[PDB]
Design an enzyme around this catalytic site. Sequence first.
Site, PDB file in Angstrom:
ATOM      1  N   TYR A   1     -36.281-114.432 -40.101  1.00 35.20           N
ATOM      2  CA  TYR A   1     -37.191-114.228 -38.979  1.00 35.20           C
ATOM      3  C   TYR A   1     -37.807-112.834 -39.023  1.00 35.20           C
ATOM      4  CZ  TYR A   1     -38.921-113.801 -34.197  1.00 35.20           C
ATOM      5  OH  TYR A   1     -39.712-113.600 -33.089  1.00 35.20           O
TER       6      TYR A   1
ATOM      7  N   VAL B   1     -40.492-122.707 -31.806  1.00 36.95           N
ATOM      8  CA  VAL B   1     -40.170-122.233 -30.466  1.00 36.95           C
ATOM      9  C   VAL B   1     -39.912-120.730 -30.462  1.00 36.95           C
ATOM     10  CG1 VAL B   1     -38.727-122.591 -28.436  1.00 36.95           C
ATOM     11  CG2 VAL B   1     -39.072-124.461 -30.066  1.00 36.95           C
ATOM     12  N   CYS B   2     -40.860-119.975 -29.917  1.00 37.65           N
ATOM     13  CA  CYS B   2     -40.737-118.523 -29.850  1.00 37.65           C
ATOM     14  C   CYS B   2     -41.845-117.923 -28.991  1.00 37.65           C
ATOM     15  CB  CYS B   2     -40.783-117.922 -31.256  1.00 37.65           C
ATOM     16  SG  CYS B   2     -40.335-116.172 -31.325  1.00 37.65           S
ATOM     17  N   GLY B   3     -43.091-118.162 -29.388  1.00 37.31           N
ATOM     18  CA  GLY B   3     -44.220-117.637 -28.644  1.00 37.31           C
ATOM     19  C   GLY B   3     -44.780-118.639 -27.655  1.00 37.31           C
TER      20      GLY B   3
END
Length: 109
Positions: A87, A10-12
Amino acid sequence: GPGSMNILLVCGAGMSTSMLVQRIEKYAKSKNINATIEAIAETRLSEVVDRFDVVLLAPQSRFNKKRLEEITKPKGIPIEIINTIDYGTMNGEKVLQLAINAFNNKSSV
């Protein structure tokens, strides 16, 4: 035997060319492991989690992490959090490693 694993990130918003994806894909593609990974938003996280196995949330989140964890708690699913260092560094090995670790561990609540 005929087996594999699926890791969700979950990020882009499902964009081409990714740092974490590249590194991870490399390590896996090199180690020759039967696994896959994908990156999407939280809106389509509940629709993908239905098939996926493990979920991972990226750092830097005000309410995103709140709702996510608030939903994972009761949902009782394998969710891992990426450290700011890991990260910003984009450690594919650490990523895939953590995901697989939680998967096999099979923890809840």
